[PDB]
């Protein structure tokens, strides 16, 4: 009573001969990465991603957002290469890297992140909380134009709202201040 | 003339008591045995005699996941490092999928 396997075995692509010539696992991190990469491949037997409920991940949704602008990638890449080459010529940066003391500004990197891959992180955080599942019923979009809203409570600070902040009702009793970049010739509709 | 002695042993009654499909509550022992045969997975704890018991109420599932040994166990460390580039283990794991929620919201008063 022996049944044939319903697919390729995980330890069948290699040969049992000439094992002394093959490169063994010299460390454990490589084996851990191999295991965590093989655990993601769809198998034909009973796996973990089947019984604990996955809400059917293999399912293409519908994008209802704005298309990305047409930007030449080769020009941007060569400009970034020239920039990092001009920045590498400095000796003070080398000394700061050797002395293990080198700090970067937070506002600049925040603005650059919001201008670049900001919308992608906002979309993934919105889909993590299940916003597109309850609002558009599966349909998702990407917020291209950035949005900035800050409440007004005391007299010096502020109460900003980002991608999953926490605002108390006592600090949101009045209408906040919404600020976003826009051109002269387009209307907007705010919904809360 | 009767040289052997001590071969009058008995059965330990070790085996699987709950198969896949039975409604197992919290605390029921899945299977007692020696040596790690069915490694625990999700919501399945262990004891001192290498036993299996459930932690939540639901349906017990038996799947086969990857086996990632602990770095402190040097025996498993060398057993893994002695493997060629592209060798996995894949042992049998026991999982308990929960069905009933751990609580809900109910109205009490109205002031």
């Amino acid at each position: 009573r022996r049944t044939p396997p319903l697919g390729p075995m995980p330890n069948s692509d290699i040969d049992l001969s000439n094992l002394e010539r093959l490169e063994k696992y010299r460390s454990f991190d490589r084996y851990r990465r191999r295991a965590e990469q093989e655990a993601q491949a769809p198998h034909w037997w009973r796996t973990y991603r089947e019984y604990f409920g996955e809400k059917t991940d293999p399912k293409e949704k519908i994008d209802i957002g704005l298309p990305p602008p047409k930007v030449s990638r080769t020009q941007q890449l060569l400009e970034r290469k020239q920039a990092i080459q001009e920045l590498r010529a400095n000796v003070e940066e080398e000394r700061a890297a050797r002395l293990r003391t080198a700090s970067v500004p937070l506002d600049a990197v925040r603005a650059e992140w919001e201008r670049t891959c900001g919308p992608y992180h906002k979309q993934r955080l919105a889909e993590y909380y299940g916003l597109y599942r309850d609002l558009f019923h599966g349909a998702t979009f990407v917020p291209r134009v950035p949005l900035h809203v800050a409440y007004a409570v005391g007299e010096d600070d502020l109460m900003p709202v980002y991608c999953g902040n926490e605002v108390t009702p006592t600090e949101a009793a009045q209408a906040p201040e919404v600020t976003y970049e826009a051109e002269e010739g387009s209307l907007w509709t705010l919904l809360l | 003339s009767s040289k052997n002695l001590g071969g009058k042993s008995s059965g330990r009654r070790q085996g699987i008591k709950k198969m896949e499909g039975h409604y197992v509550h919290a605390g029921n022992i899945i299977a007692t045995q020696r040596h790690f045969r069915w490694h625990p997975g999700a919501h399945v704890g262990v004891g001192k005699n290498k036993c299996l018991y459930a932690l939540e109420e639901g349906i017990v599932r038996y799947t086969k996941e990857v086996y990632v040994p602990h770095p402190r166990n040097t025996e498993a460390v060398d057993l893994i490092t002695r493997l060629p580039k592209g060798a996995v283990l894949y042992k049998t794991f026991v999982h308990v999928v929960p069905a009933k929620p751990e609580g809900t919201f109910k109205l009490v008063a109205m002031l």
Partner: peptide, 18 residues
């Protein structure tokens, strides 16, 4: 199990010679 198609999946000593 021996009769199930997933038989012999946890084998590991056949890939080593030490």
């Amino acid at each position: 199990y021996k009769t199930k198609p997933t038989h012999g999946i946890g084998k590991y000593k056949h890939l080593i010679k030490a």
